[PDB]
Every structure is written in C-alpha cells, then in structure tokens.
Scaffold this active site. Structure first.
Site, PDB file in Angstrom:
ATOM      1  N   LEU A  45       0.820  -1.203   0.000  1.00  0.00           N
ATOM      2  CA  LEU A  45       0.000   0.000   0.000  1.00  0.00           C
ATOM      3  C   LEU A  45       0.857   1.257   0.000  1.00  0.00           C
ATOM      4  CD1 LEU A  45      -2.515  -1.370   2.633  1.00  0.00           C
ATOM      5  CD2 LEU A  45      -2.994  -1.051   0.198  1.00  0.00           C
ATOM      6  N   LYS A 104       5.082   2.878   1.502  1.00  0.00           N
ATOM      7  CA  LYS A 104       6.278   2.762   2.323  1.00  0.00           C
ATOM      8  C   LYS A 104       6.667   4.157   2.785  1.00  0.00           C
ATOM      9  CE  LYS A 104      10.120   1.540  -0.059  1.00  0.00           C
ATOM     10  NZ  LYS A 104      10.849   0.601  -0.965  1.00  0.00           N
ATOM     11  N   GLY A 105       6.918   4.287   4.081  1.00  0.00           N
ATOM     12  CA  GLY A 105       7.230   5.562   4.687  1.00  0.00           C
ATOM     13  C   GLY A 105       8.589   5.617   5.344  1.00  0.00           C
ATOM     14  N   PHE A 151      11.136   4.354   7.287  1.00  0.00           N
ATOM     15  CA  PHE A 151      11.698   3.106   7.798  1.00  0.00           C
ATOM     16  C   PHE A 151      10.694   1.957   7.824  1.00  0.00           C
ATOM     17  CE2 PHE A 151      14.689   6.175   8.621  1.00  0.00           C
ATOM     18  CZ  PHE A 151      14.370   7.013   9.669  1.00  0.00           C
ATOM     19  N   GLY A 152       9.472   2.150   7.316  1.00  0.00           N
ATOM     20  CA  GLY A 152       8.476   1.102   7.335  1.00  0.00           C
ATOM     21  C   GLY A 152       7.694   1.044   6.034  1.00  0.00           C
ATOM     22  N   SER A 153       6.907  -0.021   5.915  1.00  0.00           N
ATOM     23  CA  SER A 153       6.029  -0.234   4.774  1.00  0.00           C
ATOM     24  C   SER A 153       4.719  -0.823   5.274  1.00  0.00           C
ATOM     25  CB  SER A 153       6.654  -1.162   3.720  1.00  0.00           C
ATOM     26  OG  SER A 153       6.887  -2.455   4.249  1.00  0.00           O
ATOM     27  N   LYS A 195       1.807  -3.429   8.872  1.00  0.00           N
ATOM     28  CA  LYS A 195       2.942  -2.517   8.881  1.00  0.00           C
ATOM     29  C   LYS A 195       4.183  -3.261   9.359  1.00  0.00           C
ATOM     30  CE  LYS A 195       4.264   2.181  10.192  1.00  0.00           C
ATOM     31  NZ  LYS A 195       4.204   3.268  11.213  1.00  0.00           N
ATOM     32  N   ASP A 246       3.303  14.155  12.900  1.00  0.00           N
ATOM     33  CA  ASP A 246       3.408  13.868  11.474  1.00  0.00           C
ATOM     34  C   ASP A 246       2.107  14.098  10.714  1.00  0.00           C
ATOM     35  OD1 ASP A 246       4.138  11.016   9.372  1.00  0.00           O
ATOM     36  OD2 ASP A 246       4.930  13.059   9.231  1.00  0.00           O
TER      37      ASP A 246
HETATM   38  C1  LIG Z   1      -3.367   1.227   8.357  1.00  0.00           C
HETATM   39  C2  LIG Z   1      -3.963   1.265   6.955  1.00  0.00           C
HETATM   40  C3  LIG Z   1      -5.199   0.684   6.710  1.00  0.00           C
HETATM   41  N1  LIG Z   1      -5.687   0.738   5.484  1.00  0.00           N
HETATM   42  C4  LIG Z   1      -5.041   1.326   4.497  1.00  0.00           C
HETATM   43  N2  LIG Z   1      -5.716   1.313   3.198  1.00  0.00           N
HETATM   44  C5  LIG Z   1      -5.222   1.736   1.887  1.00  0.00           C
HETATM   45  C6  LIG Z   1      -6.017   1.450   0.783  1.00  0.00           C
HETATM   46  C7  LIG Z   1      -5.629   1.823  -0.498  1.00  0.00           C
HETATM   47  C8  LIG Z   1      -4.426   2.489  -0.685  1.00  0.00           C
HETATM   48  C9  LIG Z   1      -4.016   2.906  -2.109  1.00  0.00           C
HETATM   49  C10 LIG Z   1      -5.011   2.900  -3.159  1.00  0.00           C
HETATM   50  C11 LIG Z   1      -4.400   2.780  -4.555  1.00  0.00           C
HETATM   51  N3  LIG Z   1      -2.989   3.037  -4.506  1.00  0.00           N
HETATM   52  C12 LIG Z   1      -2.524   3.056  -5.623  1.00  0.00           C
HETATM   53  C13 LIG Z   1      -2.316   2.061  -3.694  1.00  0.00           C
HETATM   54  C14 LIG Z   1      -2.961   1.939  -2.313  1.00  0.00           C
HETATM   55  C15 LIG Z   1      -3.629   2.784   0.418  1.00  0.00           C
HETATM   56  F1  LIG Z   1      -2.447   3.446   0.245  1.00  0.00           F
HETATM   57  C16 LIG Z   1      -4.022   2.410   1.703  1.00  0.00           C
HETATM   58  N4  LIG Z   1      -3.862   1.899   4.710  1.00  0.00           N
HETATM   59  C17 LIG Z   1      -3.290   1.891   5.914  1.00  0.00           C
HETATM   60  N5  LIG Z   1      -1.993   2.507   6.180  1.00  0.00           N
HETATM   61  C18 LIG Z   1      -1.184   3.091   5.124  1.00  0.00           C
HETATM   62  C19 LIG Z   1      -0.995   2.392   3.943  1.00  0.00           C
HETATM   63  C20 LIG Z   1      -0.231   2.934   2.929  1.00  0.00           C
HETATM   64  C21 LIG Z   1       0.351   4.178   3.103  1.00  0.00           C
HETATM   65  F2  LIG Z   1       1.107   4.713   2.105  1.00  0.00           F
HETATM   66  C22 LIG Z   1       0.175   4.885   4.279  1.00  0.00           C
HETATM   67  N6  LIG Z   1       0.808   6.194   4.394  1.00  0.00           N
HETATM   68  S1  LIG Z   1       1.759   6.653   5.739  1.00  0.00           S
HETATM   69  O1  LIG Z   1       0.938   6.758   6.945  1.00  0.00           O
HETATM   70  O2  LIG Z   1       2.220   8.037   5.609  1.00  0.00           O
HETATM   71  C23 LIG Z   1       3.155   5.514   5.993  1.00  0.00           C
HETATM   72  C24 LIG Z   1       3.647   5.000   4.650  1.00  0.00           C
HETATM   73  C25 LIG Z   1       2.710   4.346   6.863  1.00  0.00           C
HETATM   74  C26 LIG Z   1       4.292   6.262   6.691  1.00  0.00           C
HETATM   75  C27 LIG Z   1      -0.598   4.343   5.299  1.00  0.00           C
END
Ligand SMILES: Cc1cnc(Nc2ccc(C3CCN(C)CC3)c(F)c2)nc1Nc1ccc(F)c(NS(=O)(=O)C(C)(C)C)c1
Length: 289
Positions: free
Chosen positions: A13, A15-16, A18-20, A40, A134
């Site tokens: 989904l 990557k931030g 140090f994590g993904s 995560k 953040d």
């Molecule tokens: C806990 C959680 C529960 N559900 C979802 N659902 C979800 C659904 C759909 C998409 C996108 C739609 C289409 N695209 C193209 C790809 C996926 C999505 F990105 C997430 N995500 C969650 N956390 C998450 C995931 C990804 C991230 F990047 C971030 N960002 S972050 O916090 O800064 C950091 C990277 C953690 C530092 C947080």
C-alpha cells in the site's frame, strides 16, 4: 495473535519512514474466508527502530476512537524477529489521493466534515497526552465517504509527565513544510505544534491536492527554488518569522483561511485548541447547511 503462516500478501500500500504497509488477507482456515487487513513492517529491523516500533504499537493499542485506525494485533516470526503490526484495512486509501480522485464531488461541507473528524481524533490524542508530529493528509485514511481516520502513528511521542513539549531530532528528516517554527528551531513538539500542522492539513484539504498548490511547492516558490540542502530549512525558518504563510487556496472562504492562519501563529500559546477548532468548524458547517 496473528500467525505469519496465515498472512497472505496481496499488495504493497505504501512505504514511509523506515516502514512499509501491505494489504494482506488473514486466512487461517485456508478456505478464503479470512479478512483483508493492513500490515505494517520495518525495513531495517534495527534495535532502535524496533523499540520505536513497539512503542508505536503500544500507543495504537491504547487508542480507541471512531477517527483512529483500529489496531487488531501483532504478528512475529519464530522468536521475536520480524515484528509486524496488524490493523484494519480502510478501502479508500489516504485522504490525499481520495480527495484528488473525487475533487468534483467533494464540496466544502464535506471538507468540513472531514476536518471536524480530524480534530476530534486529535483532541482524543491530546487527552492521552500523545503528540502526533506527522499529521498530513497522506497520513489520514478514508473508511468511506463519511468517515476518515488518523491512520499512522510512527512519529507519535508520549509527553513527559512534567512538561508540555517533547524534544526530538531524528536522523533522516521529516515534513519541514508541515512543521511549526519552534519544531524547526528547537525540535520542540507539542499539542500546539500539532495544531500548526493541522492548519497545514486544512490548507491541503482546500487545495484539493492541486499540483502547484502543495505546501512544499508553495513554500519553495516563496523562498526560491534556487536554494540547496540545509539552507532550505534556514530560509524556511525566517519565511515563517516574517509571517510568510501559505496562501489562501482558491475558492476558500475567508473564515476557513482565518482558522488556518490562526493555527499558524508564531506564538505557541496563542494557537487555538482542538476543541475550539472543532467548535468553529462545526458551527461553520451548521451555517452552510
Ligand atoms: C493502516 C492502513 C489501513 N488501510 C489502508 N488502506 C489503503 C487502501 C488503499 C491504498 C491505495 C489505493 C491505490 N494506490 C494506488 C495504492 C494503495 C492505500 F495506500 C491504503 N492503509 C493503511 N496505512 C497506510 C498504507 C499505505 C500508506 F502509504 C500509508 N501512508 S503513511 O501513513 O504516511 C506511511 C507509509 C505508513 C508512513 C498508510
């Protein structure tokens, strides 16, 4: 509670720092009735990053609120290596991408609904003496068109019991264009600096994530894209100390921009509280409807 044996990788989904995060399916019965969850993980499972991650897991497990993403459990390899955090899966992604995709359908009253939910989540955090640090639309997830949730706590710190700020300077570097001036100058993070960064989030919302209008773009245009590296921060610093601010987004009413600028007070004590922010946003929303 979750066995790594039964986590089925579906997609990455994002990557931030140090994590993904990966979309997986927990299917212990192997009969494809398991539920889709978010997982995560760390990518350099150092001992620093791992105890930081365990503090984050405890923080999330301690939060229960309609506008905070639901913790579900943890999963770890044989032994305790490869610690992973299991959370509910929100199907519409970050508020940033969602707002960018449906910008013609999302009107100002909807933006204010999201804003009110964000400030209720943040007020809950503050009542638990947590500093998010953040907050940005990329960190806000969309459960559906009527509900958003604060969705990542990788930078959240617990206030010391005897002070109202937390001093932290982390290697690598963070969103300076969301940071309060005192966090740029003295690495001081507080509820008030979270309020400053909420003001930036409100700006974000009313730009509808238009390309020219991101805080990094506007700020680096204001300080000049000619500058390099460390000097960026320095110039940003005084741009903020001469009351240089992000502009009013196109079509934003003057009172919403006044909320924004009031959370961008250089004086840390003159910034509004999240409860006052929710108050004003809810009453503007009531007026519009
Ligand atoms: C806990 C959680 C529960 N559900 C979802 N659902 C979800 C659904 C759909 C998409 C996108 C739609 C289409 N695209 C193209 C790809 C996926 C999505 F990105 C997430 N995500 C969650 N956390 C998450 C995931 C990804 C991230 F990047 C971030 N960002 S972050 O916090 O800064 C950091 C990277 C953690 C530092 C947080």
């Amino acid at each position: 509670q979750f066995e790594e044996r039964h986590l089925k990788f579906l997609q990455q989904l994002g990557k931030g720092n140090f994590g993904s995060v990966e979309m997986c399916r927990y299917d212990p019965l192997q009969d494809n009735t398991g539920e889709v969850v978010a997982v995560k993980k760390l990518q350099h499972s150092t001992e620093e990053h791992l105890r930081d991650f365990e503090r984050e897991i405890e923080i999330l497990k301690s939060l229960q609120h309609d506008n905070i993403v639901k913790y579900k459990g943890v999963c770890y390899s044989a032994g305790r290596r490869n610690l992973k955090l299991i959370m509910e899966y929100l199907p519409y992604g970050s508020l940033r991408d969602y707002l960018q995709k449906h910008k013609e359908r999302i009107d100002h009253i909807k933006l204010l609904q999201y804003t009110s939910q964000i400030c209720k989540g943040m007020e809950y955090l503050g009542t638990k003496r947590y500093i998010h640090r953040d907050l940005a639309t990329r960190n806000i997830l969309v459960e559906n068109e009527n509900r958003v949730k604060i969705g990542d706590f990788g930078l959240t710190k617990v206030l010391p019991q005897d002070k109202e700020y937390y001093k932290v300077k982390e290697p690598g570097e963070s969103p300076i264009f969301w940071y309060a001036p005192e966090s740029l100058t003295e690495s001081k993070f507080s509820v008030a600096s979270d309020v400053w960064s909420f003001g930036v989030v409100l700006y974000e919302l009313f730009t509808y994530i238009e390309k020219s209008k991101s805080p990094p773009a506007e700020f680096m245009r204001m300080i000049g894209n000619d500058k390099q590296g460390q000097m960026i921060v320095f110039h940003l610093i005084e741009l903020l100390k001469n009351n240089g601010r992000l502009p009013r987004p196109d079509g934003c009413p003057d009172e919403i921009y006044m909320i924004m600028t009031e959370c961008w007070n250089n004086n840390v004590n003159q910034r509004p509280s999240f409860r006052d922010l929710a108050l004003r946003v809810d009453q503007i929303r009531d007026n519009m409807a």
